Amino acid sequence: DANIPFPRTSGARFCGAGYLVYFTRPGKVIIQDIACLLPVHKSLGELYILNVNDIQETCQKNAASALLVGRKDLVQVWSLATVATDLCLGPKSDPDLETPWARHPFGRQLLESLLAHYCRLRDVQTLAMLCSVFEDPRERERDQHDKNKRLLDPANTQQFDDFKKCYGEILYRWGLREKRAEVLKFVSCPPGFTFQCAICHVAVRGSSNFCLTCGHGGHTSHMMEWFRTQEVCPTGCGCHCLLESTF
Amino acid sequence: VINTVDTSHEDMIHDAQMDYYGTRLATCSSDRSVKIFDVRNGGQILIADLRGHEGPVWQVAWAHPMYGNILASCSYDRKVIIWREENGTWEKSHEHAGHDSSVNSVCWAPHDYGLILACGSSDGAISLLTYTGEGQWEVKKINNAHTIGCNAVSWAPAVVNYIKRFASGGCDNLIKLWKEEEDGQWKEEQKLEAHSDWVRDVAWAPSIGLPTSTIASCSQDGRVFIWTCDDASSNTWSPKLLHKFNDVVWHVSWSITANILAVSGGDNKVTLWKESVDGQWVCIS
Amino acid sequence: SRLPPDFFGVLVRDMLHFYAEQGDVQMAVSVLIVLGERVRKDIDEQTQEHWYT
Ligand SMILES: [Zn+2]
Ligand SMILES: [Zn+2]
Ligand SMILES: [Zn+2]
């Protein structure tokens, strides 16, 4: 074995989200916590409520969490986001009427400044949350007005989507999936016979289950109630569905 | 806190990698054995055993949970063994010996592409084993990939279809960067050569949206090079030194967000770097 | 563990300048008076006289 860089006996490595491993020669594998080193925290992650309907409630609820955790620049930035996202500043379709809030210096420019600072600080968490929350004839003017209409530049949608993908991957790392769905809800780009019930016979249109073998199905809560106590097909088929439907 | 598990091994330990959720711990060693330890609330208990590979083990890499529980092992024996497990027991699944020299490194590909496994063996070649399905794999080959043989391999973060790119470097200190054309050929693109003798490890930083691709390196002569580049599609790779220790550097690692680099080499020690506002890398511990 | 102190000064200055350009010299002077020394050391002295007059 000519190519022999053999005597390997030490190594360090990052693993998980908040973890580190290393071993040495005198030899048990010692790991360590680095949660306070990275700019992201799981504790703050579990609390960050998000919503598409009531934006203000999300901002003011996230505001208290950072104070409950210890961070400060967020208990400022979230307040600024709250005051800079009210429906009173709603844009108007006509370009004549009033200057849009985007062109106000405290509008787009503030967003770019915050994004740049937190890009330097390398904190994908706050980037993801801020971006998610803030998300011949005279004809050739309304298009430009709609371009200037938005608080986020239409020419950098890709980076925002990348931020929102990366935070989802880290959330999957941590062990929370519902939050991974809430965050990803904002991303722009996309990701015979026999139709009756079997326990109440009313036509089903939404969520349902069935056996692969039996071929008898119905409403999901119906099956919860039915299989809470028994092990037979509800329609006199004889299948022990706990041995057929599941793997 | 500090968590410690007793290895109960009889010979050396070469690598140790955990799982995606932080709920497993794998251990390679030269006893021709792998001992999987379940780490949870500070307790060392066994789950499986690897009693036979026909030789010592070098490097193991866990795969993405999306595809199940898959573990790979590249080692001294000239074989790469997978450990797909079923029904609560770990079992040998599939092996191939597409090399005539000890396998050096293995690194699991990004999950978007599929379930791909790059194998940089010591005989100047790289094999990319793709999962065809139904318990069948495809083994590609690129002969004469190195004049001294690639020491270690790494995968590039996926960007926006798709363009597969990965980086590797051998014992001729001529680290290169590959690519794949529409046909399926692994065409070469460039070759960085600002290295002294050999390059043991190569690691590529995770991508978090910043328009900048960062590659780490570690030469057999003490040097930790950070080959940053931010020229979009101009392809300008400008090396920048970080230090020069008193002995050979072995392994370079990254964080999730690419803010801390941990390099542990021949000095039987581990030092943690960073990237200051000015642009100099300093120690912390 | 906080934002850098001199972070928002540029935005304040730009907001004032933007308000002066449209012709709303009423809000610029009011902000200047209310703030005082926290902003008085960033605007040219020949412009303040223009606004005030
Ligand atoms: Zn029903
Ligand atoms: Zn039935
Ligand atoms: Zn059934």
H or E segment and range at residue C26: helix C25-35
The three-point CA angle B120-B123-B129 to 5° equals 40
State how far the alpha carbon of B194 is from the alpha carbons of A143, B98, B180, B191, B233, in Å.
51, 31, 25, 10, 21
> Is B268 within 8 Å of A25 when comparing Cβ atoms?
yes
A10: nearest Cα among B247, B275, B3: B247
For chain A positions 89-108, those within 8 Å of chain C (CB to CB) are 104-106
The answer to whether residues C25 and C18 touch, using CB atoms and an 8 Å cutoff, is no
Inter-chain contact B151–A5, Cβ cutoff 8 Å? yes
Judged by 3 or more CB pairs under 8 A, whether C touches B is no
* Helix axes A73-83 and A124-134, enclosed angle (nearest 10): 10
CA distance B114 to chain A (A): 16
Q: Which residues pair with B169 in a beta bridge?
A: B152
Which helix (H) or strand (E) segment is A63 a member of?
helix A55-69
Q: How many CA atoms lie within 13 A of B212 on its CB side?
A: 13
* Distance separating alpha carbons of residues A138 and A161, to the nearest angstrom: 33
Minimal-distance CA residue of chain C relative to A108: C11
Which residues on A lie below 8 Å from C3 (Cβ)?
Answer: 72-73, 76, 117
Count the neighbouring beta carbons within 10 Å of the beta carbon of residue A86: 12
* Nearest Cα residue to A109 out of B105, B226, B280, C13: C13
CB-nearest to A10 from B21, B122, B264 is B264
C23 shares contact with chain A (CB less than 8 Å): no
Ligand in closest contact with the CA of A213: 3
Decide if A113 touches C, using CB distance below 8 A. yes
Whether residue B16 and residue A166 make contact (CB cut-off 8 A), yes or no, is: no
Q: How far apart are CA A79 and CA A82, in angstroms?
A: 5
Residues in chain C: 53
Q: How far is the CA of A203 from the centre of ligand 2 (A)?
A: 18
Question: What gap in Å lies between CA A66 and CA A80, rounded to an integer?
Answer: 14
Q: Helices A108-121 and C9-22 meet at what angle, rounded to 10?
A: 160
Resolution expressed in Å = 3.6
| B24/B34 Cα distance (integer angstroms) | 13
Taking an 8 Å cut-off on Cβ atoms, the answer to whether B102 and A1 are in contact is: yes
Tell me the longest C-alpha to C-alpha distance in chain C.
43
Are A171 and A180 in contact, with CB atoms under 8 Å apart? yes
Size of interface A-B (CB pairs under 8 A): 137
Nearest Cα to Cα of residue B199 among B239, B238, B168? B168
- Distance (Å, rounded) from C-alpha B35 to C-alpha B90? 11
Contacts of B2 (CB under 8 A, 6+ apart): A30, A31, A32
Question: How many other C-beta atoms can be found within 10 angstroms of the C-beta atom of residue A37?
Answer: 15
**Pairing status of strand B25-29 against strand B270-272:** unpaired
Coil, strand or helix at B261:
coil
In angstroms, rounded to a whole number, what is the distance separating the alpha carbons of residues A204 and A216? 12
Structure tokens at A61: 């609820």
Distance of CA A240 to the CA centre of its chain: 39
Residue the block writes with tokens 């004549």: A96
Helix axis angle, A124-134 relative to A55-69, nearest 10°?
160
Ion ligand 1: residues, Cβ under 5 Å = A 197, 199-200, 218-219, 222
Q: Where are the beta strands (DSSP E) in chain A?
A: 11-15, 19-23, 29-32, 208-210, 217-219
CB B124 within 8 A of CB B148: yes
CB-count burial class (<10 Å; 0-12, 13-18, 19+) for A101: middle
* Rounded distance between C-alpha atoms, residue B111 and residue B131, angstroms: 12
B30: contact with A, CB 8 A cutoff: no
Range 65-84 of A in CB contact (< 8 A) with C? 70-73, 76
Question: Which ligand lies nearest the alpha carbon of A234?
Answer: 2
Token pair of B120, please?
């940089």
Distance from CA of A63 to the nearest CA of B (A): 24
CB-CB neighbors (< 8 A) of A18 in chain B:
22
Please state, in angstroms and rounded to a whole number, the distance separating the CA atoms of residues B203 and B205.
Answer: 7
Work out the minimum CA distance from B163 to partner chain A, whole angstroms: 16
Residue B219 identity (one-letter amino acid) = S
Going by C-alpha positions, the residue among A186, A197, A61, A190 that lies closest to residue A135 is A186
Indicate yes or no: CB of A8 within 8 angstroms of CB of B171: no
Contacts of C1 in chain A (CB under 8 A): 70-73
- As residues whose CB is below 5 A from the ion ligand 2, the structure lists A 214, 216, 233, 237, 239
| DSSP per-residue letters across B113-133 | T-SEEEEEESSS-EEEEEEEE
d(CA A82, CA A88): 12
Residues of B in contact with A1 (CB under 8 A): 101-102
Instruction: Indicate which of A77, A98, A103, A104 best probes the interface with C, i.e. most C CBs within 10 Å of its own CB.
Output: A104
DSSP string, A211-243: -TTT--EEEHHHHHHHHTT--S-TTS----GGG
The three-state secondary structure class of A189 is coil
Taking CB atoms and an 8 Å cutoff, what residues of chain A touch C11? Answer: 105-106, 109-110, 113
C-beta separation of B251 from A11 below 8 A: yes
Tokens of B177: 């960067």
Q: Are B33 and B24 in contact (CB under 8 A)?
A: no
**Which chain C residues are Cβ-neighbours of A73 within 8 angstroms?**
1-3
Q: How many helices (H) and strands (E) does chain B have?
A: 0, 25
Count of alpha carbons within 13 Å of B173, Cβ hemisphere only? 13
Q: Which two tokens stand for residue B208?
A: 């978090």
Q: Positive or negative CA dihedral for B5, B7, B12, B18?
A: negative
How far is residue B250's CA from residue B151's CA, in Å, rounded to a whole number?
11
